[PDB]
Amino acid sequence: GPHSLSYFYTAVSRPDRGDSRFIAVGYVDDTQFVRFDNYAPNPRMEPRVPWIQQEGQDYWDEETRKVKDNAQTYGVGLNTLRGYYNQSEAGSHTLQSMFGCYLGPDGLLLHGYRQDAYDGADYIALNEDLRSWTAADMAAQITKRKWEAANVAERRRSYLQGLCVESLRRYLEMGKDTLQRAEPPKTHVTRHPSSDLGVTLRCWALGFYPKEISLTWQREGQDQSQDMELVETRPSGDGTFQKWAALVVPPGEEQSYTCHVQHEGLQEPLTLR
């Protein structure tokens, strides 16, 4: 699919007065590559993968400056939003932002997005056209109004169409070894004589990249997918992901059941039994 460059900002107000915790994380596709946290003294934007270390000092200095200024911005924003909702200064609140860009086939912006949320719920969002805003309530309409009068959508759109896509292409080039590779899942079926004369078959897919995958159990003689126990896709800890799907069959029907695995790292869908 199309490659992605995404940023996730979390600002958490504290009842202990004035500051707020600010955390920023940056992803290329499903690979985290930078982080920022204002909790530690002398805080810096820091690498989280080897390839981004190819960048020089000036890069890290500029990124650190920008995220620190953004942090102070979100600190002020928490108080502004608290005011809008007529909430007390007693409780802690959160302001989240996700933004980023997808690379099209011509090396240009395919889709760009920017979205802000207050205490877990949609606050304001930039529209597909990248020129207008969707406020989710009346408090956000004040923000929508301010932004509309200051042509904020223009700068957001010029960032997404310009700097974002070019740095995404740059990052795809710096880590082409690992970023442009699809890693297929290592699959296997384990058998557990567990239930009362019922056999649990569990189909495992391990170490696949990117996130998206399809795991189903099919029964010879029926077309739809069979009911199963399916856990959510989970990180392996090394940048890959894993998943499994299990079901219990009578203790004689082991090879009447097939696990089907669909992943973009596989040349063709996979069948295990």
Binding site: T10, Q96, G120, A121, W204, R234, G237
Partner: protein
């Protein structure tokens, strides 16, 4: 408020006596204030915590992970404290799930 989902698992298929990696993946929770600890026979293990992030529905997720060597004796689990849980949620590790 949204309660955390908790998964405890090894990075590689667990083999007795063989070095591996133990993960506690906590997702889908809000507010972001949460305590996550990995436990070996009830005692806290020293482990790394990922940087706070969140999914497309704004719910947060964290990963707590550390090196470990499973055997047939030591018991592993993960304990999570969150405002939505009246008691700390403890999930035992199992090589099969």
């Amino acid at each position: 408020a949204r309660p955390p989902k908790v998964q405890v698992y090894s990075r590689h298929p667990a083999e007795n006596g063989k070095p591996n990696y133990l993960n506690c993946y906590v997702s889908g929770f809000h507010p972001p204030q949460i305590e996550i600890d990995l436990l070996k026979n009830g005692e806290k293990m020293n482990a790394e915590q990922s940087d706070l992030s969140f999914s497309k529905d704004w719910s947060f997720y964290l990963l707590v992970h550390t090196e470990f060597t499973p055997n047939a004796v030591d018991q592993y689990s993960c304990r999570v404290k969150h405002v939505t849980l009246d008691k700390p949620k403890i999930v035992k590790w199992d090589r099969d799930h």
